[PDB]
Design a protein around this ligand. Structure first.
Ligand code: MG
Ligand code: MG
Ligand code: MG
Ligand code: MG
Ligand code: MG
Ligand code: MG
Ligand code: MG
Ligand code: MG
Ligand code: ZN
Lengths: 57, 83, 116, 178
RNA sequence: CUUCACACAUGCUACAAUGGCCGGUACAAAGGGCUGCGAUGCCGCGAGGUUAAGCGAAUCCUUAAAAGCCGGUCUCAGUUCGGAUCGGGGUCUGCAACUCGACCCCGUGAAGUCGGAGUCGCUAGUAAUCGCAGAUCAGCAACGCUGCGGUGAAUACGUUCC
C-alpha cells in the first residue's frame, strides 16, 4: 500500500524573487518550484474627522 | 460656503452664541433655526435645539459629525411605511 | 499571473488587465504602465517576472487596492449610520442617498417590483 | 533530514524549557500529526469527488488520502448512509515536517488579503485547527487541471498539555498569529 | 411643493463589431452678447482660476459642429458593451447648495444579450440618425419646449377587410 499508488515525491528546490532559497521534498515535476512571495518578503511578517477639517483650512 | 477659497459657512448669529459660552465654559442648549450652518470644531460637546419644520430637535456634536451641516440630524419628513 | 492576489485574466492586453484589480480603472492603468515603463500593447501571457516586481511594489507605495480599500469603503458607510445623519438613515433603508427621485424610480437601491 | 525538524531540536526544544520550567526532557511538546481533510458535502449529489478531492490532496501533501463515508443518514442534507462525503490524509514523520515548512513558508502568505491566524483557535489541549478557503494556496496543484474550488481545514495535533503551551510551540515553529 | 409597499403615461441612455476606444483631418445653418460676450497669455489631469485685447457688433466674442473620412487596437465576452448606484476628492453660482443645484477628477461597475398580450409615428429632403442655437434663467433637475442645419432611405398591387 506504500507502493506505486502514491504520487511521485522527491527533492525540490524553492526560490523566491526576494532572494530566498531553500530545499524541500515536494511533488512539483522537475523540482523547480518558483514563488513570487514567501515567509521573508511578505507583509504582516515585518510590517480623524477633526484633522480633516483642519487640513482644509 | 462649499468652496475652499471662501472658507466654511457658519451663521454669525450662531457663532456669537457659543463664544459667550466658550469664554465661561458652560453647555446650555442653543435654540436655533440655522440648518444651513456647518459644524466646526468649536461646537464639540455643545448641544443644539435644531428646527426641522415643526419643532426643535436636540443634536449633540461629538467629534465625527464635524464636517457636516447642522440640519442633517433633524429629519424634516416623516415616513413609517405604507402598511 | 497574480499581481496583488488578484489573478489577472490570461491572454489579455496589459492596459485592461490591470483594471481587473479592485481600485484601478483606466486612468490608473495608464499611470501604472507609465511609471514602470511597461508598454500598453502587451499581452499578460508575455509578462516577465522581473517586470511583475516593478508594478507589484509601485502600487503599495501610492495606491489603495483590495481589502484595505474595500474595508475603507465599507467603514465610510458604517460611519454615517451611527452618527445619525440624513444619509445614514437613508443608508439603513435601502433608499437612495444622493437626493434622488423616489416616486417612479430608484429600482437600483430597491430591488425588483414588489407589486402590492 | 527535513530542515524544520533540525531547527526544532536545535533551539525550539531548548527554549521551551526556559519558558515553561519542565523537570524532564520527556515533557517538551512536539507536533505529532497534521491531518488535512476536504469534507466534500456536495458529493452526495453527482458523486464526483474522484478528481476533485482525492487528486489534489495527493498533490498538496504527498500521499493518497482516505475516503470517509457518512455514518448516519440526514434527510435535509440529502445524505444517505455509507455515501462518500469526506476525503482525509494523515501526515507523520518527515512528510509532516516537510508539509508544515512548505505550508508556512510559501503557502500561508498566498492567502488573499492575509492578516494572520487567530491564536484563540485552540480546543483546550493545544491542538490548532484553521481552515483554508481555496486550493490555489499551494503551487503543487494548478488552477487549470482542477474542477470547482474547495477549501480544507487543517489540524495540528501536538504533545502539549494546555493551550498557551501549544501556542508557544507553534509560534516558535513559525505560525503567524495576530 | 422633491415623500414611496405600488400602478400608468411621455422621453432619454442602452443591450454593441453598420460597434467601442485612441491618433489624425474635412465640411454647416439659424441665433445670443453691457449687472455682458472673454480672444490671447498663464496656472491646473479636469470642471475652472487669473490677466486682459477687441465688441452694443455682416467688424469682436460666442465658434472647435457632430456624424463623416483615413490609420491603429479590441475579437464576440455581461466584455475595452452598458454607466445605474455608492465611496472619496473638488470647482462655480448664490446671504445660503442638509432637506434639494449642476459640473469635474479618481475609485466602484447594477439591470440589461432586442423586449408577452398589445400599441405608435411616417409617402421625400420625409422617416431614421448627428450635432448647434434660443427663450425663461444668479445658478439649474434642459433627457423638455420652440427652432436650425448635416447625412439621407425603403415602399405604395391596391380598395376586400379595420
Ligand atoms: Mg410638482
Ligand atoms: Mg465604455
Ligand atoms: Mg475622432
Ligand atoms: Mg494647460
Ligand atoms: Mg474606423
Ligand atoms: Mg443578468
Ligand atoms: Mg453580444
Ligand atoms: Mg440658462
Ligand atoms: Zn521572498
Amino acid at each position: 500500500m506504500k507502493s506505486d499508488i502514491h504520487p511521485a515525491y522527491e527533492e525540490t528546490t524553492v526560490v523566491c524573487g526576494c532572494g530566498n532559497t531553500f530545499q524541500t521534498r515536494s511533488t512539483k515535476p522537475g523540482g523547480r518550484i518558483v514563488v513570487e512571495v514567501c515567509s521573508q518578503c511578505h507583509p504582516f511578517y515585518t510590517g480623524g474627522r477633526v484633522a480633516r477639517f483642519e487640513k482644509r483650512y | 460656503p462649499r468652496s475652499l477659497k471662501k472658507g466654511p459657512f457658519v451663521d454669525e448669529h450662531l457663532l456669537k452664541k457659543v463664544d459667550v459660552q466658550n469664554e465661561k465654559n458652560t453647555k446650555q442648549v442653543i435654540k436655533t433655526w440655522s440648518r444651513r450652518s456647518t459644524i466646526i470644531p468649536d461646537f464639540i460637546g455643545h448641544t443644539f435645539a435644531v428646527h426641522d419644520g415643526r419643532k426643535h430637535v436636540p443634536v449633540f456634536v461629538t467629534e465625527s459629525m464635524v464636517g457636516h451641516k447642522l440640519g442633517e440630524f433633524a429629519p424634516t419628513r416623516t415616513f413609517k411605511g405604507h402598511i | 499571473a497574480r499581481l496583488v492576489g488578484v489573478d489577472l485574466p490570461r491572454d489579455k492586453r496589459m492596459e485592461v488587465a490591470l483594471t481587473y484589480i479592485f481600485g484601478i480603472g483606466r486612468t490608473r492603468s495608464n499611470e501604472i504602465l507609465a511609471a514602470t515603463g511597461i508598454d500598453r500593447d502587451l499581452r499578460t501571457r508575455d509578462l516577465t517576472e522581473e517586470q511583475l516586481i516593478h508594478l507589484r511594489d509601485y502600487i503599495e507605495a501610492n495606491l489603495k487596492v483590495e481589502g484595505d480599500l474595500r474595508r475603507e469603503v465599507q467603514a465610510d458607510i458604517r460611519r454615517k449610520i451611527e452618527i445619525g445623519c440624513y444619509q445614514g438613515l437613508r443608508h439603513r433603508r435601502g433608499m437612495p442617498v444622493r437626493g434622488q427621485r423616489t416616486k417612479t424610480n430608484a429600482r437600483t437601491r430597491k430591488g425588483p417590483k414588489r407589486t402590492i | 533530514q527535513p530542515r524544520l525538524k533540525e531547527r526544532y531540536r536545535s533551539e525550539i526544544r531548548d527554549a521551551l524549557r526556559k519558558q515553561f520550567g519542565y523537570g524532564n526532557v520527556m515533557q517538551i511538546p512536539t507536533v505529532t500529526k497534521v491531518v488535512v481533510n476536504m469534507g466534500v458535502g456536495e458529493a452526495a449529489r453527482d458523486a464526483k469527488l474522484i478528481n476533485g478531492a482525492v487528486n489534489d490532496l495527493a498533490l498538496i501533501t504527498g500521499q493518497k488520502p482516505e475516503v470517509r463515508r457518512a455514518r448516519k443518514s440526514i434527510a435535509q442534507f440529502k445524505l444517505r448512509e455509507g455515501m462518500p462525503v469526506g476525503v482525509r490524509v494523515t501526515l507523520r514523520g518527515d512528510r509532516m515536517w516537510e508539509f508544515l515548512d512548505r505550508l508556512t513558508s510559501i503557502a500561508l502568505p498566498r492567502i488573499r488579503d492575509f492578516r494572520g491566524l487567530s491564536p484563540k483557535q485552540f480546543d483546550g489541549v493545544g491542538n490548532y485547527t484553521f481552515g483554508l478557503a481555496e486550493q490555489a494556496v499551494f503551487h503543487e496543484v494548478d488552477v487549470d487541471k482542477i474542477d470547482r474550488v474547495r477549501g480544507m481545514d487543517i489540524n495540528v495535533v501536538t504533545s502539549a498539555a494546555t493551550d498557551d503551551e501549544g501556542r508557544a510551540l507553534l509560534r516558535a515553529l513559525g505560525f503567524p498569529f495576530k
